[PDB]
Symmetry: D2
């Protein structure tokens, strides 16, 4: 599949900061019931940076168990250390994941050849399909369409991109360098609309955590070529997309879910369990606009 609305799942915690397994399972079940087309456990939105390797692996395991092969599980296996990425990738494969989401190394700022070496090493270590997570706003480095194309040519299991550049011309450039069959998924909720118009086939989504049905219907409209209907969904959802990201998306999302479903707001430091009053007011207004709150 690798298409449609694919939530980058939050990782719920109890007040003491421990992983809340029952809350996570309930979230996954609800996501599937509401029409989410795939699942990304332990991406950015799943607070990958503040989980231990054991916790990361466990959340991936739990997601696979709960999904029960109903929709593809694209497991977060990203690291700025190639050894760690391989370790996480191998666990996810053994646990029964359907694909891997692998971020460009952050902080250490490798060259394009370093990016090639990193992704090549992961691709050679596993048999699973790999989705490249290109996110310059977080990793600073930016995998060029040329480097991406080289990886596609070299490795049959490098199958797609979660493109969080926010530059929609990159979709067009990636079509040229990687082919029309290369799976392009939006890494940004607010531009998922234009992204699919350029050739994208879905979105790995933060907002889908809050509004899985509306997000799935939005993606279904674009698959059907009904962009007029898709724009109606954008009118309905854009205030939420924006409000969730006024402060870190993880925190915006957990606040939104605390209002709609009574989810816990707890996150791990340096993320904060609190938000500014204006952010909360904007999220409240966006939820009302979307019809998720009265």
């Amino acid at each position: 599949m690798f298409k449609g609305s694919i939530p980058a799942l939050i990782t719920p915690f109890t007040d003491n900061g421990a992983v809340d397994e029952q809350a996570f399972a309930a979230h996954v079940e609800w996501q599937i019931a509401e029409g989410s087309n795939g699942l990304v456990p332990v991406g950015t939105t799943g607070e990958s940076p503040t989980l231990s390797h054991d916790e990361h692996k466990r959340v991936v395991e739990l997601c696979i168990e709960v999904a029960a092969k109903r929709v593809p599980v694209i497991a977060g296996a990203g690291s700025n250390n190639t050894d760690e990425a391989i370790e996480l990738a191998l666990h996810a494969q053994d646990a029964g994941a359907d694909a891997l989401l692998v971020v460009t190394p952050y902080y250490n700022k490798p060259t394009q050849k370093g990016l090639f070496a990193h992704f090549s090493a992961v691709a050679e270590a596993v048999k699973l399909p790999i989705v490249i997570y290109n996110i310059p706003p977080r990793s600073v480095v930016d995998m060029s369409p040329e480097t991406m194309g080289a990886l596609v040519k070299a490795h049959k299991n490098i199958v797609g991109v979660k493109d969080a550049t926010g530059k929609l011309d990159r979709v067009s450039e990636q079509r040229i360098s990687c082919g029309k069959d290369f799976i392009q998924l939006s890494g940004e909720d607010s531009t998922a609309l234009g992204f699919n118009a350029h050739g994208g086939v879905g979105c790995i989504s933060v907002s889908a955590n809050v509004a899985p049905r509306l997000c799935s219907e939005f993606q279904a409209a674009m698959l059907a070529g009904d962009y007029a209907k898709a724009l109606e969904y954008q009118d309905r959802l854009m205030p939420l997309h924006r409000a969730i990201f006024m402060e870190p998306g993880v925190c915006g999302t957990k606040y939104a879910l605390s209002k709609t479903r009574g989810c816990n707001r707890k996150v791990r430091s340096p993320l904060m369990s609190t938000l500014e009053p204006a952010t909360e007011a904007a999220i409240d207004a966006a939820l009302k606009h979307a019809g998720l709150m009265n």
Copy 2:
């Protein structure tokens, strides 16, 4: 009225550097015959910065004359000096322009309140509709959706935006702040596709100078809601969009037209009448890919 494929017309020069009125008229005639839905004389692509006031005014006059009310003429009237913008706007109005394209002040970096004051002064001085030209990559400053919305509320003749931010979420934000009836036109050829998906109704276009029929058909497909067909045009045109802008777009465009139509490559310093061999090779390949050269 203001929609579809709207070329930001080049201003052809003769070898002494003077405006070539014959070549300009022929270009306008050909643009209309090939399906262009409107005309922007003396925008960025028309080398507004290197024309005198007299020359600027004359090119606007000539465009109006040649158009003969067949398509709307949205006259370039931008300046970083409010006095000059008013002077150019008043001339264009007297000459018979249908609208004005007014850029955000460049170099002097005004505040949001300065932007408001600038556009308010222009709007109060004329009766014509005004399209705000928001281009942070050139002007550095960026008119916020809030400032844009305030201008829309304050002035009935502020009717649209040529949005060259390259941030397609801005279209969605401008829909919220300015309304669904606010006329949004892409200021970037390469993302015109996603731009319309977000609610845009056309593109003020550099590439239309070279491929007016293909660009018009591309825009027509999106107006009809046929985004699958629009993507086919993007496949055909993207190499050209990219190649024209490897070096300044004015120079890329004039090279392309020198190959297809024998147009003079002459531009005014600090723009160059020459390009790098790799740029010319890429433009050549793009023209062949688009079916404009054999």
Copy 3:
């Protein structure tokens, strides 16, 4: 000379926006009396963008007349249009200027070869020494040390740079490409200290408009190699440097001068004659800290 504290002079206006010749003359006389080492009429801070060519030329003329050859007059002759730069440069030369300040073309975004052609054309048109004004925060383009070095090699009258990159390693790179004898002047008040440590010999200064004596003494300390004393001046002046630029520097400066010397706050649109309360409070506090107000 071309060294020490060189104010980029404000252009005072009367309430109706006309150039106030008597106020300008008084400002220049006071600057010289307080120890300013040179003068830049009609730079950015002189509101070059909103003066007509006639007004630009007149202010340059007046500055030359008032200075009476006591300190060098480095006349603003910048334009994004090579023809206009030459026109302004030739007038300044005829009027008796000692040098020219020539900005990198803004808005139209030329290539490095375009920058070379622009500065070469100006250099060949005049006999006067030229100071390149490299300001990427306004012009977007950035003259590389390689391009700068090429201009120095090609033209004996390209003698220096007003470097507003804010990247002090550029001073070191420019020493390599242009030589140790190349005159480097800071284009940023807040980093004039580190700039001279790297090999700079002065600053073309906004803050010198407000505190010419303190700025001259600051520069004199660095010339003497007394960087400990220079740091004491930085402690005294930094709050003013910062406060003046919270909003556009022209407006911050004119407010500061309205408080200390009763100068008119009038500027030309899109600059504003007003500031936010917090900006005015910060400038007030900075003036008190510097000892310019009680």
Copy 4:
């Protein structure tokens, strides 16, 4: 205590990728013998991202052992996860470190309040002095002078900053918000000169790995107030500063040391053990210019 030339030590590896304890010890001995005034084990340059926790802790231990209290050891204890930072900080304290270098969280992009919470939690967990490592080019987020000042007020053991903003006005702003006694150390080799002119008292240095004596003498000149001599060292060292960073600094440094001292170029993926020919040529030329190679 914390001043002068402080190398951010490389971590040498053997060909199997393991930490080379013999080579690391020899490097530390040589650094101290050549005049380095302090040591930072397992910073960015020490490849902190690609070490395991056990390896990170071991390299810190070894550095402390070899130093034998001759110069202060400022142990790398940075993480984007507050729990990990605390774990690493507590180990370093128990091992006998003199201070901690703690980076702003990377990738997860916390708010200013998140930064405050992160550094507060680390400061409360240990008794050791903490140097904040502010590096927007890697972490994206940027600790403001206001947030830094708040941390200084709240915690007596937050004593300094490794400032890698490359904005030298920040030193002046940090003097205001944090006080004149706040220990400011340059996080950039190429602007260490201007940094100290603004009030810095040293540099945590990549280049010191290659040229420890020249870097120590450079810093000694600035401490003595001899900025003319310091500039002479900048003339000698600038080509090396630049060449080391054409590609990742770790790799530039290890190449330089392979030429001068026979050090292994081995790094951990996604860093590469190879460089472009032009980079190696530039490093070669820089070493010859500095008198480190014939």
